[PDB]
Design a protein around this motif. Structure first.
Motif, PDB file in Angstrom:
ATOM      1  N   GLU A 117       0.785  -1.230   0.000  1.00 17.59           N
ATOM      2  CA  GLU A 117       0.000   0.000   0.000  1.00 17.59           C
ATOM      3  C   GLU A 117       0.827   1.295   0.000  1.00 17.59           C
ATOM      4  O   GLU A 117       1.900   1.343   0.603  1.00 17.59           O
ATOM      5  CB  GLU A 117      -0.920   0.034   1.216  1.00 17.59           C
ATOM      6  N   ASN A 118       0.335   2.343  -0.665  1.00 21.13           N
ATOM      7  CA  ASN A 118       1.071   3.615  -0.662  1.00 21.13           C
ATOM      8  C   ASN A 118       1.329   4.129   0.759  1.00 21.13           C
ATOM      9  O   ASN A 118       2.394   4.671   1.054  1.00 21.13           O
ATOM     10  CB  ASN A 118       0.280   4.657  -1.457  1.00 21.13           C
ATOM     11  N   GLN A 119       0.370   3.915   1.662  1.00 20.21           N
ATOM     12  CA  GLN A 119       0.425   4.338   3.056  1.00 20.21           C
ATOM     13  C   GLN A 119       1.662   3.809   3.797  1.00 20.21           C
ATOM     14  O   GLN A 119       2.332   4.560   4.503  1.00 20.21           O
ATOM     15  CB  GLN A 119      -0.866   3.857   3.740  1.00 20.21           C
ATOM     16  N   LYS A 120       2.002   2.527   3.619  1.00 17.17           N
ATOM     17  CA  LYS A 120       3.135   1.896   4.312  1.00 17.17           C
ATOM     18  C   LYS A 120       4.466   2.453   3.823  1.00 17.17           C
ATOM     19  O   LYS A 120       5.353   2.704   4.637  1.00 17.17           O
ATOM     20  CB  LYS A 120       3.076   0.368   4.163  1.00 17.17           C
TER      21      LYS A 120
ATOM     22  N   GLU B  92       4.601   6.191   5.352  1.00 15.41           N
ATOM     23  CA  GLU B  92       4.978   6.129   6.766  1.00 15.41           C
ATOM     24  C   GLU B  92       6.433   5.687   6.952  1.00 15.41           C
ATOM     25  O   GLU B  92       7.135   6.225   7.803  1.00 15.41           O
ATOM     26  CB  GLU B  92       4.034   5.173   7.507  1.00 15.41           C
TER      27      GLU B  92
END
Ligand SMILES: CCCCCCCC/C=C\CCCCCCCC(=O)O[C@@H](COC(=O)CCCCCCCCCCCCCCC)COP(=O)([O-])OCC[N+](C)(C)C
Ligand SMILES: CCCCCCCC/C=C\CCCCCCCC(=O)O[C@@H](COC(=O)CCCCCCCCCCCCCCC)COP(=O)([O-])OCC[N+](C)(C)C
Ligand SMILES: CC(C)CCC[C@@H](C)[C@H]1CC[C@H]2[C@@H]3CC=C4C[C@@H](O)CC[C@]4(C)[C@H]3CC[C@]12C
Ligand SMILES: CC(C)CCC[C@@H](C)[C@H]1CC[C@H]2[C@@H]3CC=C4C[C@@H](O)CC[C@]4(C)[C@H]3CC[C@]12C
Ligand SMILES: [K+]
Ligand SMILES: [K+]
Lengths: 294, 454, 212, 174
Positions: D91-94, D97
């Motif tokens: 995921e782009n989120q990981k 972060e």
């Protein structure tokens, strides 16, 4: 032009050839218009061959030739940075220390071999002209020209003589095998040098934009995979000069093997000639049987 | 004539050139077939007499066929591969140059095949399958020319350049690694002068194993030729008109001695026919056959021609030793050229190796000896000079009696150390019932019967 | 046992020349042939590309317009050792009216620059940050933007190939006329001289030996 | 030894030539450009995701010139415009972060506490490294295993010639 590195070798070769020609012409024509040669020559065969006196110079010449080769493998491994390198340390200096010794050894042989025209056209003379002059140019710019320094490999042909002076290769049959084997590894390492030189530095017609980024060990590999007739084509010559040389080396290689294919007289016919020593074990005793045995 | 290949090669180039001027544009069609007529390269080298050799013209034909077929077939690949296939409306072009076709075909028929460049057009592949089959069929056909290249290129010898200002001899008859050995060791000896005349050899069968090594050991003064001494053609190339002498050798180990020396007579005939004035030195196995040389009208022994009869000397030296032992080894040491040698030891051979250094020589004696008796002269030669005199010519007079007086211009025969010493004898001036044969030469008696002497 | 063996005596001179005469003649022939062959190679090898530059004409053209296109073209920038990383630059187009063809054409530094981007009249020396590429285009653009149409200037052109591209420089320097007709010719001349010179000495030697 | 010589020394000289210094942060930025990275799934997924480029500049303590920081030459060669690369994930989120977390560790320590870093003016004035590319395997293994191989060979020859020469001398003792 190339900063006249190549020109220093080429001019000192042909200049000496013209000097000998003019001298030999005028030394005769002046009859029509109206010493150290031994006492040093003998050292040039007695300190280096025949009586084996003192210390074999041929052995030092051989070891320093290999030393210059190892320096060529090191220099050709670097990406030709030129402006700055560690050559200020030993790398360049130690090559210069071998080149002075080669110049002196050439100096001894120049007075020795009677008719200087025939001496000038000896292959070991040519191999010195194509390496000594550009090294003394190299100190002006402080940069190692990777030109014809691989021709040092062309004189490990003399490996049979030193094994013949140590009496290791005493057998009259086996020295032929060591000659033929030495010719192959010497020509292989030499021809790979030409491919490296011509293929790495691109063609004139493309303003030298036509480089293929090749290393000397890939040229040793390419030429082996080619003359074995395998030819994977994962690495191959792209420069138009490189292809031209490859068509010469394929013809030359197969002509060379066709020439030496008739040595089965040495290898199959005579290597099998056993018997000629009989070590004597002390503390035992024996008989000798002879005459007619079946 | 219409179906000659050089006619076809003109039809496939001349007509389209005269079409080309209408459109003013160069059609690259079958203009590469011009390469198909450099096959004629042998004839012009054969008209300039450069390719005079009957073997070497085959090599130039085979070499020319290969480079002509290679350049021609590369032309077809260029033509077919550059202009695409009909089926794709010619959209199927691969952008190839003639030099890449010359390269591709070379990398292919060498069986290397890198595959960095290769034929993409379906016609091009079809032609490549033909050229691989054709190439390997062609090489299988011409693989049997080792008869030219390995078998006959090695046939050396057929010219012998004549160096002016020198002179030479010709040796022929029967030559082997042993037969020349005892000759060459003594002829090229170091203790003679710079008499550098030895430059030739001539007999039909080619040299063998270490005979070539023995020739290479004397590379400057051997110059062997293949050729038979019965052809006046072969004698002409060996320049025998210029030669100083012709030495003929014969095998004493023959299976029939009376066949060899008879054969050897006509070797003398062949030489004397080609040129009458040349010196012949020859060897004869039997004695009786020596008479035959006098029949040859231009044999004159007074000019130097002579026959060394092996049985006559062999039994002669042995016979002489029955009067005094060692005389055989005495005489056999006077003819071989031999250095003086020092030995420090007191072994018997120390004194013997002084003796062996003594060869025999001859020289005209000084006018200062004329009118003296032979013994008086012989003393002075051994006491004042250091030379021993055996005989004088009065026609070969050996140890003359005191009643014989020396006249002007006589030769003396000397046994002394080195040819350079004998000249002292010339420069010397002040300083300080029937019982015999018809000639009486030998003893004779009435013929016996063999039953009376067994 | 083996006596004094032998004696050390030898007096030879290879006559005068034999192996040296053969080698020097052979070498002269090799230099003659390799001179002719090298000229034969460097001929159709060099003339085929050299004709294309030689065929290009010269003229004295003038600026017609200057524009920013927007499209940010990718370029490769090195870091001194094997960085295959890339950055981008803004495309500028400088049009000229050609003084002989009187047709709208884009200017290009050299045929290399033309072949690598036929839609832009300049390529900057490619660098890390977008800012350095942008300024390296602006600085070149400025030199045309302050000299639009004033001062007509020398430029190179080829209607046979294309009417709408114009070059500021030639692609080949004078190395061709100076090196193609020179080094194989010099190689041939040295070969001819060594053969002639050696045959002079060979023919003279016997004539000198006969003078005694 | 002859092989492992010019085979190992040619790359090892390039790390050895790189110098050491004690540099300081000059600025930290977000570039915007979302670079592609490959993420594995444990068996042959050639799928890709993306991460935001961060640039950390340092002023070098000896060269006094603006340069980007880079973890190792691998990271430098794979992206010369960004001072970090995250371990790439689905995921782009990981990815985001995983950049933020590394960015935070510099954002709370800007310019305070100067730190050890590696540099090479011969190659480039504007890139700086946090680590060396080669561990001490070269000096420890190049001059060792061929040397040990040679030493064992010499010992077996010498030892065997000792036993060979002694054997006849022992047999003669009777
Ligand atoms: C005589 C010498 C022949 C002329 C060689 C010049 C070849 C040449 O012009 O470059 C050609 C290259 O194409 C090649 O790379 C072919 C090179 C292989 C040479 C074949 C040897 C034939 C010998 C008997 C064409 O160059 P280009 O247009 O860059 O092609 C892309
Ligand atoms: C015994 C002697 C040995 C010296 C040669 C072997 C070691 C070479 C050192 C490494 C080297 O130069 O690698 C080169 C590649 O090289 C290849 O991939 C080709 C290897 C060819 C082997 C030829 C054997 C010749 C034996 C005789 C270049 O390495 P790199 O630039 O990192 O390549 C990216
Ligand atoms: C018949 C053959 C030898 C023609 C000549 C080929 C070789 C020997 C010559 C021709 C062109 C020359 C090259 C052209 C220029 C360069 C670029 C320079 O940075 C390194 C040397 C190098 C690469 C030269 C080396 C020697 C060279 C390669
Ligand atoms: C058996 C073989 C010869 C079949 C025929 C192949 C050759 C000889 C023929 C067949 C199709 C022909 C080509 C088709 C059309 C073109 C395009 C033109 O712009 C150049 C000539 C060229 C390329 C022709 C040359 C000759 C050609 C290639
Ligand atoms: K193959
Ligand atoms: K293959």
């Amino acid at each position: 032009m190339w900063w006249a590195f190549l020109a220093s070798s080429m001019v000192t070769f042909f200049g000496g050839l013209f000097i000998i020609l003019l001298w030999r012409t005028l030394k005769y024509l002046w009859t029509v218009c109206c010493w150290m040669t031994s006492v040093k020559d003998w050292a040039g065969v007695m300190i280096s061959a025949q009586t084996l006196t003192g210390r074999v110079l041929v052995v030092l010449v051989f070891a320093l030739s290999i030393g210059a080769l190892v320096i060529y493998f090191i220099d050709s491994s670097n990406p030709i940075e030129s402006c700055q390198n560690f050559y200020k340390d030993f790398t360049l200096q130690i090559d210069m220390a071998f080149n002075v010794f080669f110049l002196l050894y050439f100096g001894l042989r120049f007075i020795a071999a009677n008719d200087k025209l025939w001496f000038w056209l000896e292959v070991n003379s040519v191999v010195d002209f194509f390496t000594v002059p550009p090294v003394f140019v190299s100190v002006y710019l402080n940069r190692s020209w990777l030109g014809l320094r691989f021709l040092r490999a062309l004189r490990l042909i003399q490996f049979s003589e030193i094994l013949q002076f140590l009496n290791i290769l005493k057998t009259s049959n086996s020295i032929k095998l060591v000659n033929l084997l030495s010719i192959f590894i010497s020509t292989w390492l030499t021809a790979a040098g030409f491919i490296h030189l011509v293929e790495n530095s691109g063609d004139p017609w493309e303003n030298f934009q036509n480089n293929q980024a090749l290393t000397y060990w890939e040229c040793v590999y390419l030429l082996m995979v080619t003359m074995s007739t395998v030819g994977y084509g994962d690495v191959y010559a792209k420069t138009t000069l490189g292809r031209l040389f490859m068509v010469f080396f394929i013809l030359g290689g197969l002509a060379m093997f066709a020439s030496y294919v008739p040595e089965i007289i040495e290898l199959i016919g005579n290597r099998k000639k056993y018997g000629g020593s009989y070590s004597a074990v002390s503390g035992r005793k024996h008989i000798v049987v002879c005459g007619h045995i079946t | 004539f219409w179906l000659e290949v050089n006619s076809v090669v003109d039809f496939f180039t001349v007509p389209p050139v005269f079409v080309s001027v209408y459109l003013n544009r160069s059609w690259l069609g079958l203009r590469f077939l011009r390469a198909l007529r450099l096959i004629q390269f042998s004839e012009i080298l054969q008209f300039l007499n450069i390719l005079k050799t009957s073997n070497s013209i085959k090599l130039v034909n085979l070499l020319s066929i290969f480079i002509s077929t290679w350049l021609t077939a590369a032309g077809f690949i260029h033509l077919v591969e550059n202009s695409g296939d009909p089926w794709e409306n010619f959209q199927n072009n691969q952008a190839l140059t003639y030099w890449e076709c010359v390269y591709l075909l070379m990398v292919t028929m060498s069986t290397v095949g890198y595959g960095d460049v290769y034929a993409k057009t379906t016609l091009g592949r079809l032609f490549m399958v033909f050229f691989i089959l054709g190439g390997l069929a062609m090489f299988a056909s011409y693989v049997p020319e080792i008869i030219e290249l390995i078998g006959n290129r090695k046939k050396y010898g057929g010219s012998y350049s004549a160096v002016s200002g020198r002179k030479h001899i010709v040796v022929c008859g029967h030559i082997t690694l042993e037969s020349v050995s005892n000759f060459l060791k003594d002829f090229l000896h170091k203790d003679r002068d710079d008499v550098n005349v030895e430059i030739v050899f001539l007999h039909n069968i080619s040299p063998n194993l270490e005979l070539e090594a023995l020739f290479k050991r004397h590379f400057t003064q051997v110059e062997f030729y293949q050729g038979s001494v019965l052809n006046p053609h072969d004698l002409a190339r060996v320049k025998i008109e210029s030669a100083d002498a012709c030495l003929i050798l014969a095998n004493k180990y023959c299976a029939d001695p009376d066949a060899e020396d008879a054969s050897n007579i006509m070797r003398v005939i062949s030489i004397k026919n080609y040129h009458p004035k040349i010196r012949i030195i020859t060897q004869m196995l039997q004695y009786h056959n020596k008479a035959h040389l006098l029949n040859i009208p231009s044999w004159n022994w007074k000019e130097g021609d002579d026959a060394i009869c092996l049985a006559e000397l062999k039994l002669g030296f042995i016979a002489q030793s029955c009067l005094a032992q060692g005389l055989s080894t005495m005489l056999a040491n006077l003819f071989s050229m031999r250095s003086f040698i020092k030995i420090e030891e007191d072994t018997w051979q120390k004194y013997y190796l002084e003796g062996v250094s003594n060869e025999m020589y001859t020289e005209y004696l000084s006018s200062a000896f004329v009118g003296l008796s032979f013994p008086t002269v012989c003393e002075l030669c051994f006491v004042k000079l250091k030379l021993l005199m055996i005989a004088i010519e009065s026609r070969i007079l050996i140890n003359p009696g005191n009643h014989l007086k020396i006249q002007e211009g006589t030769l003396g025969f000397f046994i002394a150390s080195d040819a350079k010493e004998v000249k002292r004898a010339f420069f010397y001036c002040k300083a300080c019932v029937k019982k015999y044969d018809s000639t009486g030469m030998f003893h004779w008696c009435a013929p016996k019967e063999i039953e009376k002497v067994i | 046992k083996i006596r004094d063996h032998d004696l050390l005596d030898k007096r030879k001179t290879v006559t005068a020349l034999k192996a040296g005469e053969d080698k020097s003649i052979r070498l002269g022939l090799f230099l003659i042939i390799s001179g002719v062959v090298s000229l034969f190679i460097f001929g159709f090898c060099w003339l085929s590309p050299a004709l294309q530059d030689l065929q290009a004409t010269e003229a004295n053209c003038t600026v017609l317009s200057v524009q920013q296109i927007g499209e940010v073209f990718e370029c490769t920038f090195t870091c001194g050792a094997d960085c295959r990383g890339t950055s981008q630059y803004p495309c500028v187009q400088v049009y000229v009216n050609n003084s002989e063809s009187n047709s709208r054409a884009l200017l290009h530094s050299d045929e290399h620059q033309l072949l690598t981007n036929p839609k832009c009249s300049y390529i900057p020396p490619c660098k890390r940050e977008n800012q350095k590429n942008l300024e390296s285009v602006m600085n070149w653009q400025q030199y045309w933007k302050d000299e639009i149409g004033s001062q007509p200037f020398t430029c190179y052109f080829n209607q046979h190939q294309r009417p709408d591209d114009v070059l500021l420089h030639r692609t080949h320097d004078e190395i061709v006329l100076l090196h193609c007709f020179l080094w194989p010719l010099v190689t041939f001349v040295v070969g001819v001289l060594i053969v002639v010179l050696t045959i002079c000495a060979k023919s003279l030697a016997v004539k000198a030996e006969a003078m005694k």
